[PDB]
Design an enzyme around this catalytic site. Structure first.
Site, PDB file in Angstrom:
ATOM      1  N   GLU A 784      68.860  56.685  59.113  1.00 51.48           N
ATOM      2  CA  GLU A 784      68.762  55.982  60.543  1.00 51.48           C
ATOM      3  C   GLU A 784      68.552  54.480  60.378  1.00 51.48           C
ATOM      4  O   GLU A 784      67.372  54.114  59.749  1.00 51.48           O
ATOM      5  CB  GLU A 784      67.917  56.742  61.395  1.00 51.48           C
ATOM      6  CG  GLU A 784      68.097  58.569  61.416  1.00 51.48           C
ATOM      7  CD  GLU A 784      69.500  58.536  62.096  1.00 51.48           C
ATOM      8  OE1 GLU A 784      69.395  58.550  63.370  1.00 51.48           O
ATOM      9  OE2 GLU A 784      70.319  58.941  61.355  1.00 51.48           O
ATOM     10  N   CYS A 818      63.889  49.964  66.504  1.00 53.75           N
ATOM     11  CA  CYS A 818      65.253  50.213  66.249  1.00 53.75           C
ATOM     12  C   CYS A 818      65.895  50.215  67.493  1.00 53.75           C
ATOM     13  O   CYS A 818      67.141  49.549  67.623  1.00 53.75           O
ATOM     14  CB  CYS A 818      65.585  51.376  65.420  1.00 53.75           C
ATOM     15  SG  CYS A 818      64.683  51.321  63.825  1.00 53.75           S
TER      16      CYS A 818
END
Ligand SMILES: Cc1cc2nc3c(=O)[nH]c(=O)nc-3n(C[C@H](O)[C@H](O)[C@H](O)COP(=O)(O)OP(=O)(O)OC[C@H]3O[C@@H](n4cnc5c(N)ncnc54)[C@H](O)[C@@H]3O)c2cc1C
Ligand SMILES: O=C(O)c1ccc2ccccc2n1
Ligand SMILES: O=C(O)c1ccc2ccccc2n1
Ligand SMILES: [Mg+2]
EC number: 1.5.5.2
Lengths: 1195, 112, 56
Positions: A784, A818
């Site tokens: 990720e 993120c």
């Protein structure tokens, strides 16, 4: 260097006994609140009889006495009514009456008539009494066309005149204070008084606050001039909101509130004193109540304001603190000698308080949850006020005839002007109180709360004022199914005779119970609670004294290594602890130790592994204050963000434990040793999530924390080990990237869980591709990475809400999420106003070392991060882009800080690299280019988070169907995805999936995936069905059967709503991934791969090197449209996954070629031809769909 | 009631589009709208943008909005029954244009 | 019942939609079948009539 946390959150003043009793009641259980309110509210049988009779008489007079007449006259549907009012609203924006009437007769009646329907939710409440969060603008457009074509100019004229009356006369007393003052004389002559509400709150910028200040200043002069010495009881007054006078009105900013907002209130109060008018401080959100008391205290003790009794203060009876607040106020009135005017209201923020407490995971609500409790509280607080009319002036604001009658008789026969008064809302309350004011009625005065402002201002928050709902009194009196006996029912006696006195409402979950039986929600901490702040101050100071260490913690004990200090990124003088880093030899040793212990851990039953996770969750919850302080100082996070991070770690543990209990059995064999590599930006939560998932799936774990944040990771491992994870199942390997590479490269490593940079993800993918599992299959990688996250805002959004959500999404955690907002896209027509507001909000952020509650934005993690971010800013500035930056304090020089920055770009393509810091880029777009804009956002290759702010259903449907992102957010911020509510993970350059905190996650960490809860779909892909028929026509009978089975087994089309907080809709859906790279070896293999990809909605690119073109002769056009052939895989991407057939040598070679492809990291599944023949699940359909989470703010 | 193909022209009898066939300018039937925008229509509009056919690009977007494609209603009826009424694409439309701008308008109507 | 329903349905639909700009076609020829010799007969004719067209 200041001592850590020595100034974390000192109270404005020492908390007196009375102030402490307020704080102690903040979230008191509802069953403890109600019994003393019932007792205080108790009245004699004779009084209760007389009150019910007075209430009946008032209601009978009310029931014995606009939009409905218009609807009936022209046979309007509800949508036509709403549409007409929207049209009228827009017609009233044409200021010149002549041009408007011209436009009506000549053009608008003729047919062809910013969306007209931006405020339709408000007109929908007016027309239907129902509220919708968003507007079906296509239905309203159809309705508007229909009604105009059917009824022509006459209905437009009626709508315009109706809306003119409502917006100029009914919803506001006047557009300006002068006009409202002129219009007030009629009811003043009849014995009413007024308090003017200059429609305005929630200053966003310094300029906004200054504007509200001079509005209040000018209004006080106008009101005081008109009052003409009538005094504070007979004459008019003003009501103010403290949130209008300062853009940072909160407990976290208490010093600025006392230093900057309080002097402004004092100046306005001095002016009200000069004219001898009332100045009332309105009450707002629960977390501002106690802060406002510190201002009230200073004002009432300020000798410059002596001689004036006009200072007023609202108290909200729906709040559990209300009677203790009154005790405090009454005492303050005695100490100061000021007869404080106390407005008793029920409260206007109920929905929002329920949602906020649930979101924040707090112990209980700060408001009651049954409306009848608020009524008892109100009457009980009225009794307290009526006992103190010598020192306070009670002002009973209510539209409830039962409440009114109870207080009227409670007050008794002796009355004089100035003893107490009633209050009502302009427009709304006059019918009731014309039965109260005057010697012919009850001979009690009523002050009218009189909104003042233009249409635009009025429409800004008219929804909330109208909800003040099936339980509201004004709704029920107009409900003919509700009798008068129902309306005069005594709430005090109803509550007294309920089975449990004060029981919580049955249909409202406590924050801890949001998920019901599935799992226990994590608990947060209330940073507006002085007890919490005082206790946290000590726990945080204590955490800062601990000699935190992180060591290589192998199965055999702690290992030796090189040791260095861990430093506070906000102040490198603040040493947080010591990390001993892992030698590569010991890293390789740890993997062998994990491999040796793998069978013993896999043999622990899933429920007992889940119990370890649940126990660790209890430990982290209990240790949260200490974990907070470590995260604050090691990771540079604010306390608010550290709380959310510890909550998320708790949620991961309980969520994966529950998911395990729902799914895992003996056939779901573990992969083996899993290397978990976690990032520095969530050094506990993502650390814990990956490790918890791998462990509970039965895999031993090599935990490699970010080199910047080893201490909190060592503490996480300590807690997991205390919870029962054996040392051989969880080993800690602190160090730099070479340690992680050694772990990833080790032959016994059976899987990798990675969260971090694209660069390292690609290095890991390349290394894993060099090897295979003993079974000859690719080593699973969950990776990720970042996103170039965008938000799109159109002209229907509320600017203030947009700006709050943008400031938070871009600059929270210094932009080191993120999910952080990187690109804001503003529709051209609203871009300049929103940009102005955004820049003003930017400069109200406090940047500094995060051991102070007042700090909004902390440091970036390292000097290298800081240099990389600032190099981007300077390049943009050198290209001529407009760059706005907050000026940093000199104290930031001891750490690594980047000022929150706004950069105006010409086109989205001007941004060419991920900038992982507090840097928001802004672009503008014309409405007609919205679809191309979405193309532009999709073109970056990322697809993590995406935000949309609009009120228009057509825009929502368009954008959400066209955007390609894994986490969507509508009308809210785009950060802080909640485990099990917004499962988190994106597509493309943003990740491989499956989503963390989602139901497919554990299935990636076992060799045979289980069926997740609720994981199925009744939809069958139509191209799959066509392909199955084609296979049967080709004589490929086994493959046709496998295709049909894949069609049924696919969960493509799953569409679920996930349990969460009220005022939000959280959706989870399974879509096609995109185009799957197919690398077959045989014809049967190709058919099976095609079946799997088509059943999950995908298109395919088939490797031309297979030479199997002749195997797909005479395909149906439907299937052919999904099939392309690739001779150059890198040239024909991006793909969204891969299916590979071959022997072990062929799989490895293909896997290496796939790892080298530019763009997204592909989730690859490989199988031998024999495996395809023997195993119907050789390819898993879990990994051929894309998970999409969407979170819609419906409040 | 009414079908497609060899079964009828439409519009359905006892349905909300029927009366509009019997006047020269069709009205907007009750509840006749959709928030769905056909994505190929949207692509066509962008292509029109790119070649500067501004009047046609605008007509394409307006048809995209005006279309009731995707309407999905439940009609009132007896208990124990769900009666649904939906608007779908018709199929392939024969386009007989005379001019380029005429073709763009017809295509916009059909794609929307 | 169906004939009654057609009459009342097209009547209501008319009240919801038809205005001065929705001009009639003119004479409408309604050709009806033997299998529903009242209902379809009535439905076609009622719709044509209420839309402002004389009917053959
Ligand atoms: C003149 C005036 C000034 C006001 N100023 C303020 C202010 O500065 N700040 C502020 O917060 N409010 C203020 N209010 C109150 C608010 O705006 C509403 O008008 C008021 O709450 C409605 O109460 P009621 O007695 O008129 O009606 P009712 O129908 O009697 O009471 C409704 C109230 O019950 C409460 N309630 C509803 N559902 C529940 C539930 N499920 N559980 C527990 N309680 C529930 C809510 O407070 C709701 O407003 C003011 C009201 C007036 C008339
Ligand atoms: O923890 C790290 O920062 C890390 C982990 C694994 C890695 C593999 C290859 C290259 C760099 C790495 N860096
Ligand atoms: O040992 C290191 O610190 C290390 C090793 C390899 C790396 C590859 C990419 C980025 C950082 C790295 N850091
Ligand atoms: Mg390095």
């Amino acid at each position: 260097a200041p001592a850590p946390f020595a100034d974390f959150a000192p109270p404005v003043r020492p908390q007196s006994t009375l102030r402490r009793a307020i704080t102690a009641a903040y979230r008191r259980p509802e069953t403890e609140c109600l019994p003393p309110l019932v007792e205080a509210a108790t009245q004699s049988k004779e009084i209760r009889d007389a009150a019910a009779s007075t209430a009946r008489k008032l209601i009978e007079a009310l029931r014995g006495k606009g939009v409905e007449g218009l609807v009936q006259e022209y046979s309007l549907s509800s949508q036509e009514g709403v549409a007409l009012m929207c049209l009228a609203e827009a017609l009233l924006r044409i200021p010149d009456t002549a041009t408007r009437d011209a436009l009506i007769r000549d053009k608008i009646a003729d047919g062809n008539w910013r969306s007209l329907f931006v405020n339709a939710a408000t007109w929908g409440l007016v027309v239907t009494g129902k509220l919708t969060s968003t507007v079906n603008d296509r239905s309203l457009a159809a309705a508007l066309t229909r009604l105009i074509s059917r009824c022509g100019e006459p209905v437009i004229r009626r709508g315009v005149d109706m809306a003119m009356r409502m917006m100029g006369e009914q919803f506001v007393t006047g557009e300006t204070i002068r006009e409202a003052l002129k219009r007030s004389k009629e009811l003043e002559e009849k014995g009413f008084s007024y308090s003017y509400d200059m429609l305005g709150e929630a200053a966003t910028t310094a300029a906004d606050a200054e504007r509200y200040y001079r509005d209040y200043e000018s209004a006080i002069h106008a009101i005081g001039k008109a009052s003409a010495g009538r005094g504070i009881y007979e004459g008019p007054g003003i009501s103010i909101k403290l949130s209008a006078l300062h853009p940072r009105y909160s407990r976290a900013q208490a010093a600025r509130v006392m230093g900057e907002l309080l002097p402004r209130v004092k100046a306005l109060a001095l002016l009200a004193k000069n004219y001898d008018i009332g100045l009332n401080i309105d009450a707002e959100e629960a977390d501002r109540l106690e802060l406002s008391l510190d201002l009230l205290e200073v004002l009432c003790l300020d000798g410059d304001l002596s001689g004036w009794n006009g200072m007023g203060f609202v108290v909200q009876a729906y709040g559990k603190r209300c009677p203790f607040v009154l005790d405090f106020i009454i005492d303050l009135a005695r100490r100061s000698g000021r007869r404080i005017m106390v407005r008793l209201v029920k409260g206007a923020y109920w929905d929002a308080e329920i949602k906020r407490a649930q979101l924040d995971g707090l112990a209980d609500f700060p408001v009651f949850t049954r409306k009848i409790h608020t009524d008892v509280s109100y009457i009980a607080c009225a009794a307290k006020l009526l006992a103190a009319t010598d020192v306070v002036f009670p002002q009973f604001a209510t539209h409830n005839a039962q409440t009114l009658a109870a207080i009227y008789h409670m007050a008794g026969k002796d009355f004089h002007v100035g003893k107490y008064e009633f209050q009502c809302l302009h427009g709304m309350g006059e019918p009731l109180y014309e039965e109260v004011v005057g010697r012919g009625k009850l001979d009690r005065p009523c002050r009218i709360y009189a909104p003042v402002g233009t249409h635009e201002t009025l429409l800004a928050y008219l929804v909330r004022r109208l909800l003040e709902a099936n339980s509201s009194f004004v709704h029920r009196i107009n409900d003919p199914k509700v009798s008068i006996d129902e309306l005069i029912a005594d709430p005090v006696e109803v509550v007294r005779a309920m089975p449990v006195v004060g029981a919580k409402h049955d249909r409202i979950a406590l924050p801890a119970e949001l998920f019901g039986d599935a799992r226990t929600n994590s608990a947060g901490l209330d940073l507006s609670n002085e007890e919490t702040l005082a206790s946290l101050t000590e726990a945080l100071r204590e955490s800062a004294a601990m000699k935190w260490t992180a060591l290589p913690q192998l199965a055999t004990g702690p290992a030796a290594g090189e040791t260095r200090t861990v430093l506070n990124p906000g102040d490198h003088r603040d040493v947080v602890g010591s990390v001993t880093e892992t030698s590569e030899e010991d890293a390789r040793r740890a993997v062998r130790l994990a491999a040796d212990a793998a069978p013993d851990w896999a043999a622990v039953p899933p429920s007992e592994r889940a119990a370890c996770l649940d126990r660790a969750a209890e430990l982290m919850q209990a240790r949260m204050p200490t974990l907070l302080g470590l995260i604050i100082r090691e990771a540079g996070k604010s306390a608010l963000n550290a709380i959310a991070e510890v909550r998320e770690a708790i949620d991961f543990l309980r969520y994966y434990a529950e998911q395990t209990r729902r799914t895992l059995g003996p056939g779901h064999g573990p992969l083996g040793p899993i290397v978990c590599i976690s990032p520095w930006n969530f050094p506990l939560a993502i650390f814990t999530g990956q490790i918890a998932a791998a462990l509970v799936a039965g895999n031993p774990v090599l935990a490699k924390p970010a080199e910047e944040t080893p201490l909190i990771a060592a503490e996480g491992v300590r807690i997991l080990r205390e919870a029962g994870i054996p040392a051989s199942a969880l080993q800690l390997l602190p160090g730099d990237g070479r340690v992680g590479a050694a772990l990833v490269a080790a032959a016994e490593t059976a899987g990798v869980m990675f969260t971090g940079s694209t660069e390292v993800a690609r290095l890991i993918q390349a290394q894993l591709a060099d090897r295979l599992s003993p079974a000859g299959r690719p080593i699973p990688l969950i990776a990720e990475t970042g996103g170039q996250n965008a938000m799109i805002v159109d002209s229907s959004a509320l600017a203030e809400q947009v700006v709050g959500d943008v400031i938070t999404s871009a600059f929270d955690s210094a932009g080191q999420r993120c999910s952080a907002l990187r690109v804001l896209c503003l529709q051209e027509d609203v871009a300049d106003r929103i940009l102005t507001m955004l820049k003003g909000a930017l400069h109200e952020l406090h940047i500094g070392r995060t051991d102070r509650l007042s700090v909004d934005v902390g440091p970036v993690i390292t000097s290298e991060a800081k240099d990389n971010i600032e190099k981007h800013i300077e390049r943009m500035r050198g290209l001529g882009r407009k760059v706005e930056q907050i000026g940093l304090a000199s104290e930031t020089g001891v750490g690594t800080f980047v000022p929150p920055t706004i950069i105006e770009l010409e086109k989205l393509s001007d941004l060419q690299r991920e900038v992982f810091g507090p840097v928001l880029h802004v672009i503008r777009y014309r409405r007609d280019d919205l679809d191309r804009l979405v193309d532009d956002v999709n073109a970056t290759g990322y697809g993590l988070t995406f935000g949309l702010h609009t009120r228009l259903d057509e825009t929502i449907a368009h954008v959400t169907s066209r955007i390609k992102a894994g986490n969507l957010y509508i009308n809210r911020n785009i950060i802080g995805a909640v485990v099990g509510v917004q499962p988190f993970g994106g597509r493309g350059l943003s990740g491989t999936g499956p989503k963390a905190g989602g139901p497919l996650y554990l299935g990636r960490l076992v060799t045979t995936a289980p069926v997740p809860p609720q994981h199925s779909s009744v939809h069958t892909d139509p191209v799959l069905l066509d392909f199955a028929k084609w296979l049967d026509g080709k004589g490929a009978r086994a493959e046709a059967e496998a295709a049909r089975n894949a069609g049924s087994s696919s969960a493509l089309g799953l569409d679920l709503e996930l349990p969460g907080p009220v005022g939000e809709r959280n959706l989870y859906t399974l879509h096609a991934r995109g185009r799957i790279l197919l690398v077959p070896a045989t014809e049967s293999g190709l058919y099976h791969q095609l079946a799997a990809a088509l059943a999950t909605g995908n298109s395919v690119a088939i490797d031309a090197a297979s030479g199997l073109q002749a195997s797909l002769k005479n395909l149906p056009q439907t299937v052919g449209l999904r099939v392309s052939w690739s001779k150059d895989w890198a040239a024909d991407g991006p793909f969204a996954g891969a299916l590979v057939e071959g022997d072990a040598e062929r799989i490895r070679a293909v896997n290496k070629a796939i790892a080298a492809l530019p763009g997204p990291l592909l989730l690859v599944q490989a199988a031998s031809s024999g495996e395809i023949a023997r195993n119907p699940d050789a390819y898993c359909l879990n990994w051929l769909v894309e998970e999409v989470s969407a979170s819609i703010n419906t409040a």
